Design a protein around this nucleic acid. Structure first.
Lengths: 108, 82, 99, 97, 97, 111, 99, 82
DNA sequence: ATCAATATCCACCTGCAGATTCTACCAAAAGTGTATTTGGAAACTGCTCCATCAAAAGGCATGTTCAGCTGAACCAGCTGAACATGCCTTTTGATGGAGCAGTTTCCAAATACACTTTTGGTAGAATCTGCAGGTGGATATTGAT
DNA sequence: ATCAATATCCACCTGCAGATTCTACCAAAAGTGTATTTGGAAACTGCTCAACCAAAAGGCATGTTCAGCTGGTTCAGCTGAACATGCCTTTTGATGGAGCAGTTTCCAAATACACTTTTGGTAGAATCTGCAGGTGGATATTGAT
């Protein structure tokens, strides 16, 4: 009975591999689930989470705020071409819009 | 109160929304059209939300019912669970 | 004589102000009443959670802002600065919101 | 004695945030938004992997289907960096048995 | 001896056509379009039923979930007539055991 | 060993209830499938087929053709508001479009 | 002197003719060559089934006709009858085809 | 000599397509924009089609791969199987 | 270009409203050992795909002409932005009791599964007929007069 | 109105490519019987919602002023629609091998599945600190001149 290790630590990840495995089994996605699928998926979710938080933290520093709020997430997403494509039809609650005024109407 | 209805969605609130949309000047006839458009959107969403409600044999519409109704119309909403 | 700003300057101030903040712009109570009236015609004696109404208000507002954005681009396209019903009808027709 | 048990991704998001920006917190609403986000991407990927498996008459979902789904759903460089991380993770797991 | 076996809804579409318009044929391309249509509506309904069952912590798909899915996906009178046909069919099935 | 009666005839339907049941089990939709679900679904699919074929046969008679081709299916779908909504983002191969010309460009009246 | 129709009449005849028929309007072979080049930039020595090419052709033409319809509505909206690139860019922007 | 091969989608074919769209008059600059638009659409579809090809370990692009690629772009195609 | 009158930042204090951390415990993660399906390696094979010719003809690449079109000023209403004043629906704080969302438990009825057994579905072969082309004629449209 | 050169509708004919039907083999659809588990229904409970008065207060209604916005009118390039002309790129068999999509069969190998043993994650309670709210001055933004 060797000591209890977990898969997130073995894979070098923070996200929970085991829970993702259970969620795949439970949800009628496939009859069986391979060992590598939840590791790969967890890694992808971790990378994307880090990227969003990175940009929101940058936006947070521009506003001199130490805590991330939804506004900073909306600004991060809409200012990133690829995230905007991925989330082009998604509504971020309490996000607002980008300070974008069409140039021709702003004053002489 | 003036219609017991959508007319409680006053002109200045619609103006504010147009301002957030970056609109500088607004014709007087826009307001009723917007109200109708809003009413249609709402009807479809509420219809689906209530349908989910009815399926569960529940008499309380939850936030999740709305999120799913919005999801099927391609207007996924984040921040209210799921 | 009272000080007076020309038409458009204050509108721009409101645009910058409301695009900087995130608070909801529609009143909570008439929205709840509208929701309840519409729901009444489908099923009687329904109740609503407060967060369901906040969710609907957020969805409605995000939908309308997006439509005013598309409308403004259509108006600007016609060498105008005033949005008109035909611009809204055009935006909704092209998205396929056929009503 | 009654009490239920609602799971969330909050603790893991908070750990990642402290790894990327040690001097930063996060509100509860934003954390809820991130949890919703994670659930959405989960459902999208698993659903796409399921259809790929069904089209090729395969009953097993492997890291290959995840990889393919990722390449289909995500654009360009985002896909390349995420895919790289997944491959790295599976490689570390398979070696540290 | 090799020969595989590919299923379609062709024979059933042709039977229905002969029921509704006895003096009329159909091209092969149109039959293919009808088969595609049927497959699409099948997946849409089953997928929606699946999500409802999952949201209500329900492991069974019954005629109730189908009915609800139909009311959500189809508009007005089309939904009402289809629901009426499904109800009448289920009552006929349950009676003639 | 009573004689073989199909589920379709018992339901008074033409579509194959049994095949639909097999397809629900095979496809990861639910762990178990009730007996009434495939009957209801088959009835809905059969009804919709009858409606499309009905409109398509009317369009066929309009063009004095006895055989339905894809063109008639496109005309049927786009001229029916509810089918158009259901299939609004769907492309019918070899379907074409409706003879729709925007009224203001077609020729002048005082001519 | 040769008989001569005014500008617009035959264009209208072409509209009625092509809206009455369903035949493919793009040439098969150049489309095949375009497809093979693009595919070559992703993966080498790929082959294609003829029905795959026909499916792509149907999709392309349905997409373009839909875009030209929206473009025409945008042109007419500007009190014009001539479509211009800005009309297409507007139509694609409103659909969210951001490219 | 051939013409970078995108040019085989000739001006008259685009004109015909515009005619099916109900377009009566066309500026000379439309054609290049249209070509770019078509290329983008095609690029995305074939990319996904080839991805489906690679996953199946096949060297022949089938109609089904295209149909699925189109499905994921919300442009479901009927008539070529499934 | 500068004064006048607002607007909004730059900066600070406070304390409190959520936000972070501590303690507990139990439900899910993980280990162990058995049983069961599955991906892939290699052999067969004949169905379909790239490449080549071949002869033609039907679309198209170039060049010529002018008719409505596009953009561009000018200006006569005209109606839609801003403010005052003032009235009031909406909002915030309470209150509190009623219905029901949600959890727990039990059991007839619903349903998976293994074996068996008949037969509806489908593939290829054999009809057969509806419409793709073709010929001729008869209205019905554009456009100059 | 008149009237002549093209386009299109319509009557009829023809034959062959694809629609329709027939006949065979078998994978899949029903029938029995048995084992599994789960959905309906009843009891309970405390979390949440509907009603609901008081007040305060920030937002909305109506009316007035007038500034510049918009659509009607008109006019000088202009350029993109039709034809004519020639030509050369695309169509449609025909060949004709190359290679690969199935198809089957074997076998290590990945993984369900029952059971056992911990321990990570989350629900409630105890600290904590960043910014909401308020305010004091320091500059940025436009209107009239």
């Amino acid at each position: 009975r060797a000591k209890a290790k977990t898969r997130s630590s073995r894979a070098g990840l923070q996200f929970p591999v085991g829970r993702v495995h259970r969620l795949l089994r439970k949800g009628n996605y496939s009859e069986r689930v391979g060992a590598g699928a939840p590791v790969y998926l967890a890694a992808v979710l971790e990378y994307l989470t880090a990227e969003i938080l990175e940009l929101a933290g940058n936006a947070a520093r521009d506003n001199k705020k130490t805590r991330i709020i939804p506004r900073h997430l909306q600004l991060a997403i809409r200012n990133d071409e690829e995230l905007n494509k991925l989330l082009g039809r998604v509504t971020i609650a309490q996000g607002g819009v980008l300070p974008n005024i069409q140039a021709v109407l702003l004053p002489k | 109160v003036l219609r017991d209805n959508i007319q409680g969605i006053t002109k200045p609130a619609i103006r504010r929304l147009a301002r957030r949309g970056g609109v500088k000047r607004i014709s007087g006839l826009i307001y009723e059209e917007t109200r109708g458009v809003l009413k249609v959107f709402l009807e479809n969403v509420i219809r689906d939300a209530v349908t989910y409600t009815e399926h569960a044999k529940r008499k309380t519409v939850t936030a999740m019912d709305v999120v799913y109704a919005l999801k099927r119309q391609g207007r996924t909403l984040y921040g209210f669970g799921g | 004589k009272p000080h007076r700003y020309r038409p458009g300057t204050v509108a721009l101030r409101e645009i910058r102000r409301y695009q900087k903040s995130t608070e909801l712009l529609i009143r909570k109570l008439p929205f709840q009443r509208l929701v309840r009236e519409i729901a009444q015609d489908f099923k009687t004696d329904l109740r609503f959670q407060s967060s369901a109404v906040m969710a609907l208000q957020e969805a409605c507002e995000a939908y309308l802002v997006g439509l005013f954005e598309d409308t403004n681009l259509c108006a600007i396209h016609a060498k105008r600065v005033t949005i008109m019903p035909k611009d809204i009808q055009l935006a909704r027709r092209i998205r396929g919101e056929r009503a | 004695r009654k009490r239920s048990r609602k799971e969330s991704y909050s603790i893991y998001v908070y750990k990642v945030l402290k790894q990327v920006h040690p001097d930063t917190g996060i509100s509860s609403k934003a954390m809820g938004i991130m949890n919703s986000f994670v659930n959405d991407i989960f459902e999208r990927i698993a659903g796409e992997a399921s259809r790929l498996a069904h089209y090729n008459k395969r009953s097993t979902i492997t890291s290959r289907e995840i990889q393919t789904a990722v390449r289909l759903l995500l654009p360009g460089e985002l896909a390349k960096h995420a895919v790289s991380e997944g491959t790295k993770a599976v490689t570390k797991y398979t070696s540290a048995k």
